[PDB]
Design a protein around this motif. Structure first.
Motif, PDB file in Angstrom:
ATOM      1  N   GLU A   1       0.829  -1.183   0.000  1.00 35.97           N
ATOM      2  CA  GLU A   1       0.000   0.000   0.000  1.00 35.97           C
ATOM      3  C   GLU A   1       0.872   1.244   0.000  1.00 35.97           C
ATOM      4  O   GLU A   1       1.805   1.341   0.810  1.00 35.97           O
ATOM      5  CB  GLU A   1      -0.785  -0.050   1.299  1.00 35.97           C
ATOM      6  CG  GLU A   1      -1.562   1.226   1.590  1.00 35.97           C
ATOM      7  CD  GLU A   1      -2.314   1.074   2.891  1.00 35.97           C
ATOM      8  OE1 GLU A   1      -2.211   0.035   3.552  1.00 35.97           O
ATOM      9  OE2 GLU A   1      -2.991   2.028   3.237  1.00 35.97           O
TER      10      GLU A   1
ATOM     11  N   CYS B   1       1.559   5.023   0.900  1.00 32.82           N
ATOM     12  CA  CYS B   1       1.106   5.982   1.886  1.00 32.82           C
ATOM     13  C   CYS B   1       1.519   7.389   1.457  1.00 32.82           C
ATOM     14  O   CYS B   1       2.684   7.745   1.575  1.00 32.82           O
ATOM     15  CB  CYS B   1       1.700   5.652   3.244  1.00 32.82           C
ATOM     16  SG  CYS B   1       1.163   4.028   3.850  1.00 32.82           S
TER      17      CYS B   1
ATOM     18  N   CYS C   1      14.304  -5.909   6.267  1.00 34.09           N
ATOM     19  CA  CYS C   1      15.185  -4.769   6.043  1.00 34.09           C
ATOM     20  C   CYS C   1      15.650  -4.153   7.366  1.00 34.09           C
ATOM     21  O   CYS C   1      15.262  -4.598   8.444  1.00 34.09           O
ATOM     22  CB  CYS C   1      14.472  -3.689   5.236  1.00 34.09           C
ATOM     23  SG  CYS C   1      15.551  -2.296   4.856  1.00 34.09           S
TER      24      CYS C   1
HETATM   25  C1  LIG Z   1      15.465  -2.255   3.111  1.00 32.23           C
HETATM   26  C2  LIG Z   1      15.446  -0.995   2.330  1.00 32.23           C
HETATM   27  C3  LIG Z   1      14.601   0.187   2.659  1.00 32.23           C
HETATM   28  O1  LIG Z   1      14.932   1.336   2.324  1.00 32.23           O
HETATM   29  N1  LIG Z   1      13.448  -0.086   3.326  1.00 32.23           N
HETATM   30  C4  LIG Z   1      12.136   0.407   3.088  1.00 32.23           C
HETATM   31  C5  LIG Z   1      11.051  -0.378   3.477  1.00 32.23           C
HETATM   32  C6  LIG Z   1       9.757   0.044   3.230  1.00 32.23           C
HETATM   33  C7  LIG Z   1       9.480   1.263   2.595  1.00 32.23           C
HETATM   34  C8  LIG Z   1       8.075   1.674   2.281  1.00 32.23           C
HETATM   35  C9  LIG Z   1       7.065   0.683   2.278  1.00 32.23           C
HETATM   36  C10 LIG Z   1       5.747   0.968   1.968  1.00 32.23           C
HETATM   37  C11 LIG Z   1       5.417   2.281   1.626  1.00 32.23           C
HETATM   38  N2  LIG Z   1       4.234   2.855   1.300  1.00 32.23           N
HETATM   39  N3  LIG Z   1       4.377   4.188   1.061  1.00 32.23           N
HETATM   40  C12 LIG Z   1       5.663   4.452   1.226  1.00 32.23           C
HETATM   41  C13 LIG Z   1       6.391   3.290   1.608  1.00 32.23           C
HETATM   42  C14 LIG Z   1       7.726   2.981   1.924  1.00 32.23           C
HETATM   43  C15 LIG Z   1      10.579   2.027   2.190  1.00 32.23           C
HETATM   44  C16 LIG Z   1      11.882   1.610   2.422  1.00 32.23           C
END
Ligand SMILES: *CCC(=O)Nc1ccc(-c2ccc3[nH]ncc3c2)cc1
Length: 320
Positions: A87, A89, A154
């Motif tokens: 999802e 955000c 991560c």
């Molecule tokens: C392991 C590398 C890293 O930079 N991690 C990471 C994990 C999850 C997000 C993330 C996930 C879901 C989402 N929805 N809207 C924005 C995000 C960011 C980013 C980076």
């Protein structure tokens, strides 16, 4: 690499928004709905020996369906990659919000914090912990609602519990309570309770557990912080004394509803109809296919339409 062939039948890739060992996160558009998602791309070769652990954590995340947890939509494995579609955000990080506001009022802290407690209580109730709570891992949706991201797979020491930093074994749930106390302090103060310019000095400060309490904090604030920020994990409030906590209840008069307002399976009729139309299926057949919940393209389209619905938007698939 031909690892992107299947993916690109369903998504259009935009900009990278995160990198790390083992994983890259990209913005993308799911073609059938036109909805933006986030795609975590993991290389199997890099994972190597840890690949089984990630598969396990993927399965855990399939059971973390909750209004304040960033939802998994799609898992696509190729010869060299695992793609997890999540999802999107759009409101950016809590971190950004706190800085823009300088510090939040007790009242607004409470709005935000109850949402965090909800997510984290739900995680703990499923027998998991987050283990890395911090304002960077809390994103706002379209409606300024918080979504927890980044469970495992991560990954800041400022938010880490004393027993975690001493490398001892630690209960995830208890370390989460500590981290949430730091979060509480930062929300209401606009700065860290413990800071230093080198790890050893910071570690000492955290293990000592002493911090200043600014003049603007209410007695009740101060008291909830003291119950959460206990260096001894055993002495820390339980997640369940926290849902009911007087500070948490002020001005609401009802406890945090942590249980998922999410249908066990109960399919959404409008989503099923749209898919039935698109796939030229009768309703029952379409419901039977969705109910396999394979986290394939069908699961993803279904979940995206359902999020289109939950956000009052039209339950439609773009098709020209
Ligand atoms: C392991 C590398 C890293 O930079 N991690 C990471 C994990 C999850 C997000 C993330 C996930 C879901 C989402 N929805 N809207 C924005 C995000 C960011 C980013 C980076």
């Amino acid at each position: 690499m031909k690892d992107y062939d299947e993916l690109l039948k369903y998504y259009e890739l935009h900009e990278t928004i995160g990198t790390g060992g083992f994983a890259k996160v990209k913005l993308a558009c799911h073609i059938l709905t036109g909805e933006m998602v986030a795609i975590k791309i993991m290389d199997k070769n890099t994972l190597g020996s840890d690949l089984p652990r990630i598969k396990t954590e993927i399965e855990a995340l399939k059971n973390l369906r909750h209004q304040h947890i960033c939802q998994l939509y799609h898992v696509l494995e190729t010869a060299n990659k695992i793609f997890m579609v999540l999802e999107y955000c759009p409101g950016g990080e809590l971190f950004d919000y706190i800085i823009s506001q300088d510090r939040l009022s007790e009242e607004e802290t409470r709005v935000v914090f109850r949402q965090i407690v909800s997510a984290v209580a739900y995680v703990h109730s499923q027998g998991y912990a987050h283990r890395d709570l911090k304002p960077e891992n809390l994103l706002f949706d379209e409606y300024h609602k918080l979504k927890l991201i980044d469970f495992g797979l991560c990954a800041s020491l400022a938010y880490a519990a004393p027993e975690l930093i001493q490398g001892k074994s630690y209960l995830g749930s208890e370390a989460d309570v500590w981290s949430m106390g730091i979060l509480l302090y930062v929300l209401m103060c606009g700065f860290l309770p413990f800071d230093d310019d080198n790890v050893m000095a910071l570690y000492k400060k955290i293990m000592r557990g002493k911090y200043d309490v600014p003049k603007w904090l209410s007695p009740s604030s101060i008291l909830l912080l003291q119950q959460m920020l206990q260096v001894d994990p055993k002495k820390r409030i339980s997640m369940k004394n926290l849902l009911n906590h007087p500070w948490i209840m002020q001005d609401y008069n009802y406890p945090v509803e942590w249980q998922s307002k999410n249908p066990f399976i109960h399919l959404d009729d409008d989503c099923v109809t749209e898919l039935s139309v698109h796939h030229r299926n009768n309703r029952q057949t379409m419901e039977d296919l969705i109910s396999l919940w394979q986290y394939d393209h069908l699961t993803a389209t279904y979940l995206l339409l359902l999020a289109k619905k939950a956000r009052g938007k039209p339950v439609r698939l773009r098709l020209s």
